[PDB]
Amino acid sequence: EFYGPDRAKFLGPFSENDTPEYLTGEFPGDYGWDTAGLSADPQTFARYREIELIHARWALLGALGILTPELLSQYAGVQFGEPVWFKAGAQIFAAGGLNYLGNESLIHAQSIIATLAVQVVLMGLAEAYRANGGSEGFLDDLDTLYPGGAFDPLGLADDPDTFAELKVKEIKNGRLAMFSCLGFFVQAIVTGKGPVQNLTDHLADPTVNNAFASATKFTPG
Amino acid sequence: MLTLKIFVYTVVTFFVGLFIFGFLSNDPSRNPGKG
Amino acid sequence: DLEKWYGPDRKLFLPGGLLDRDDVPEYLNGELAGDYGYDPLGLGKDEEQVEKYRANELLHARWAMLAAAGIIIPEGLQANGADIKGGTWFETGAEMLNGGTLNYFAVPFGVVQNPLPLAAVTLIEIVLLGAVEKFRVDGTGPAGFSPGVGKFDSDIFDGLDKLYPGGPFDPLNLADDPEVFAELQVKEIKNGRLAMIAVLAFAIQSYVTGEGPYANITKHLSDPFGYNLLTVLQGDDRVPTL
Amino acid sequence: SAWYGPDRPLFLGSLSGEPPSYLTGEFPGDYGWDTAGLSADPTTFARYRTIELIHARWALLGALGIITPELLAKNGVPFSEDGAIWFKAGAEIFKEGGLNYLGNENLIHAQSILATLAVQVIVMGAAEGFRANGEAPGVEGLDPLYPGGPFDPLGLADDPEAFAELKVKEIKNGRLAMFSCLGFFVQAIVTGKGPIQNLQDHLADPGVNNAFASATKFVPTP
């Protein structure tokens, strides 16, 4: 179960026989899905898994940030500049500006250049510290992928027997978040509407209103 | 008269194909002598 | 490769069935580049006179190549649309007689108005050409900085071979191998003979037709029967034979 | 013509040079064409080889399925308005007539895209799971990439030399078909017509009906 040769795999019984020999299952989130063979060398497998984990956490942030303003605008009644996620960047160009809760007393930003500059400098320092794994005494230790100290204030990083279990949970729902955010990206281009907006239009009539109705919009002319 | 033309065209094409591929099929080698 | 142009079994100016192998003069034994055994008149005399005339032939060959390029290219540019002002070769000197000056077209960023007058051009040409022709006989050159060798001194032309000085005159190398060097020597002398024939043709065609060789070739390709030696020698036309 | 061994034909001819060391010509279609270098590891090479062969076979099927119906419509088969051209064939199901096979109303006549997609998902998922596992009910253990058996009923692959030559034929036909399939994909979005229609338009006057007629189509506009 999720570890060892009797672990869960990406094709069930169909993945029983043909499994790559370097997919041992020691590493979390192992379902044996390397049918394209990009990770034969375990150093590039380590690299690919750290990019995979960083993308999983980033898409967890993304998927929680796509749904929250639009769900608050429709199912909670609060007003925003735009609850549409792919139109939420241009609201800083409006006369009112960008408000955190629709109120001009919160954030109220009007300088896209200044907010880009502060975002670049803060995240450059943060990502350079993450890639370096700390230096000069402070945080000059750990495994630079699952740090723990100064990043786990709730104390859940201990008890390794269940720590690996919710690590597998983290990778699984991070993969779900990456899939959901890819769905958000594709739905933005095709439908041109917000995700839970398309969900609400789907609940009105699932027979007609689906992805196949808009499948004819990209035909060449 | 169209199906008559189809039948005749098929017959002529068949016999011409037999001619061409039979002469392609190692025709100089069918000799009693050497070579 | 090399046997086709050197040795007893080489390409002669007449084939084997039209010229016997012992009919070649004894001083042409396939040791020089471009040896075709072509000497019907008693001008070669002996091997040392042949070697002495080889210098004249090679200098005239290189000058004829530079010539043929200098006649064909600017006239073609002038006829095709470049602002040359004197691209035709037998009249390019008349554009500087009183106060005019030739525009230089250095492709592709061409069209530049040169400000040197005829007197200054002639003086600098005589000075530079006398200097280089005196350096050629003496084999001495003061300065350096050629791409063949970085900043060569003056004591490098001494000990070299005249009429074929390697080193500073060979920036691209590709001549240290003796076999390809000999093959390229044959290529050079054949191209030079072709250029000599071409420039004599340019002069004779200019005297006959009154126009440049580029105009000659363009009008001939436009109408070969309507423009050739037969047409230009005839005049205007003839009464039709009915 | 000696497609194997060290003296096999290469991807560039006499100007190719020395092929990579791991490309020994053992496998079919080995011309040494690995100028990126995504087959240094033998395991990655095997995975990319089976990926390439699966792509090849799917592309043979796809290329034939693109070419056939437009020729049939041009040859009298009543494909109504847009079922002739492949990138509108999927649009046939949202009408009232549905997918009428060969223009016959009582042939197929399908309108539930959800149900046909569903049955395709279960059927093809079972097929790919059996293929990936290498074991199926009634099928013993054998070569996953080149099974034969029930997949080669004629059994004309028994001879080893003929099998190797036919393997080279299969991979070269596959590469040609998948080159043609990417040609169809690019040609559809650029021109907007079928491949046979593009061939017919090109054969009318190849001087102007070429790929350079649509070179100015996708130019950006301020």
Next chain:
Amino acid sequence: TINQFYGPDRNKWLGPYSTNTPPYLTGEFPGDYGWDTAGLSADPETFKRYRELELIHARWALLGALGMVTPELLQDDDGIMFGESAIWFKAGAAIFQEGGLNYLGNPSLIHAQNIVATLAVQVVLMGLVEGYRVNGGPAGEGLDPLYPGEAFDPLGLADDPEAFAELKVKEIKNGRLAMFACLGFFVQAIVTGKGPIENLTDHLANPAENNAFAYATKFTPQ
């Protein structure tokens, strides 16, 4: 010095925050700033072939980056020298104009009209050049595939070893800068529809709003 960009304590892609350099990325090759986050150059043969095609891309990008802006830099006040084809992404249509593709606007230079013939000449010449590059030809057969330097470098320079290495990293850094510039040229052409030099002039006219954020809403799926 050389130890600043070849030793173990060389400058990297993160400055003082780059202690996690991969172990196979030591400092033997030009450039080599430790930027291998993806880890896909782990195989030494793959890394070598990547570096070869990277330097090929670098030289091509240097030529392209210097060549896209040269006609726009030489463009006059109104455009007798170059018509609509002064811009790089619409320069190809210069072959289709009535006069023809002149080099600097005059009929005496180039003046080509057959795009098919010039593409055939390009294909033949470039195929011969690439075959000679990967195999060897009139220039040299057993030379270094990345740094031949006997016929393409006749001006000395690459004779002193430390100087050759220093100009090598100069070459790879200028090539990477030109690649970044060429990618910027492509993306600017996609979103603005104007030349890079005129984009620079509009940005210098008023940098408060003439930025990429002026075109951030262009690709909004309405």
Next chain:
Amino acid sequence: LVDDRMNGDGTGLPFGVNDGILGWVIAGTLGTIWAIYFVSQKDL
């Protein structure tokens, strides 16, 4: 018109075909004979 004719004579029809079925049966017959000859060449 009192009678029906194909009227395919003249007009420079390629190989004399006036319908696509004639070209198709010609190509099919040639392909069948070629396939038999190819798979049965060299006396097997």
Next chain:
Amino acid sequence: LGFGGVYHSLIGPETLEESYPFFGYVWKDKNKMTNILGYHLIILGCGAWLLVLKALYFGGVYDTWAPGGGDVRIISNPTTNAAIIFGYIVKSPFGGDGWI
């Protein structure tokens, strides 16, 4: 040509391979026979393109179909349609079509 033919018939080389391998040939050398065939095919192609050049640029060829009773007509835009040319080569040889 008569001088050349008489020369090779009388005092020319008897056989060509021992002295001129480019012109020497045996009847069983299929590569050499195809080389000679290719040389002659290139020559014939140049000969046909000579008439093409005359009709297109040298202001020749007499069109009997020109209005007024024919005239020497320089030909502009010849019909190079492959379907048209192959249609002439595959049409019937009888009265309605006339083949070629």
